[PDB]
């Protein structure tokens, strides 16, 4: 039954995107919306390409589940180093509707020896975001920076210039995340002291309910059990992992 609790707790809080494979479209994000709503409760997002929040928002409000946030992504997936371009996508995105944008790291930009652009960008999007209320959340794309020592410059760097939440992947690289780089990223929000002000999504290699409660350990070894709420955690994941907790919950 420990198994039960987290998997209804994991559920709470999801950011349901479609699958890999699938995109997007008008059809298949109306099916989104519909599977974000189940017998249990409410996931407490969904994750979808900034055209389509206009249609998600109708959708989500005439089913009665106005509550669900809409998080969308620019810069994406490639994390390239043009503020200009970032600033615009991330402009737009919020004039879409979206209650959370994450935009992506230039982290080809930091391995070749530049710290400053990723700092000056996501300031620049958290500068756009913020004059809105709007969430930013920066995606760092743990599984090309590989190395530990990236991993947390990344992080500091984000946290620096004001994320509200830092992401380990985009979901359209092969490595997503691992227990190892989310550990990273969440020990150096405790070691700069702001986890009141600054959440963690892992994204990827969270497929199972078994997955999720080994995920949420970390968060609850870290933080203490009260702090993963769906302002400071979320599992950016698809329909198969949504499914395994509401089967892991009898249904």
């Known amino acids: 039954?420990?198994?039960?609790?987290?998997?209804?707790?994991?559920?709470?809080?999801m950011h349901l995107a479609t699958s890999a494979n699938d995109d997007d479209t008008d059809e298949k994000v109306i099916a989104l919306c519909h599977q974000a709503k189940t017998p249990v409760g409410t996931t407490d997002a969904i994750f979808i390409y900034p055209r389509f929040i206009?249609?998600?928002?109708?959708?989500?409000?005439?089913?009665?589940?106005?509550?669900?946030?809409?998080c969308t992504s620019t810069n994406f997936p490639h994390g390239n180093d043009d503020i200009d371009i970032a600033l615009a996508e991330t402009r737009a995105a919020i004039a879409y509707g979206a209650d959370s944008v994450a935009v992506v790291f230039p982290y080809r930009a930091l391995m070749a020896g530049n710290e400053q652009v990723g700092f000056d960008l996501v300031k620049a999007c958290?500068?756009?975001?913020?004059?809105?209320?709007?969430l930013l959340a920066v995606i760092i794309e743990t599984g090309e920076l590989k190395d530990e020592?990236?991993?947390?410059?990344?992080?500091?760097?984000?946290?620096?210039?004001?994320?509200?939440?830092?992401?380990?992947?985009?979901?359209?690289?092969?490595?997503?995340?691992?227990?190892?780089?989310?550990?990273?990223?969440?020990?150096?929000?405790?070691?700069?002291?702001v986890e009141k002000t600054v959440g963690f999504i892992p994204v990827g290699g969270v497929r199972?309910?078994?997955?999720?409660?080994?995920?949420?350990?970390?968060?609850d070894e870290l933080f203490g059990a009260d702090w993963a709420d769906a302002r400071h955690y979320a599992f950016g994941a698809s329909a198969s992992l949504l499914?395994?907790?509401?089967?892991?919950?009898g249904h």
């Open 1 to 13: 039954t420990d198994l039960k609790a987290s998997s209804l707790r994991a559920l709470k809080l």
């Open 54 to 70: 206009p249609i998600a928002r109708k959708t989500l409000k005439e089913q009665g589940t106005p509550e669900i946030r809409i």
């Open 126 to 134: 958290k500068e756009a975001c913020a004059a809105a209320n709007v």
């Open 149 to 193: 020592a990236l991993i947390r410059k990344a992080s500091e760097i984000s946290i620096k210039a004001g994320a509200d939440n830092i992401v380990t992947s985009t979901g359209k690289v092969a490595v997503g995340a691992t227990p190892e780089s989310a550990r990273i990223m969440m020990e150096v929000i405790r070691d700069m002291g």
């Open 208 to 219: 199972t309910a078994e997955d999720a409660q080994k995920y949420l350990a970390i968060a």
């Open 243 to 249: 499914a395994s907790l509401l089967k892991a919950l």
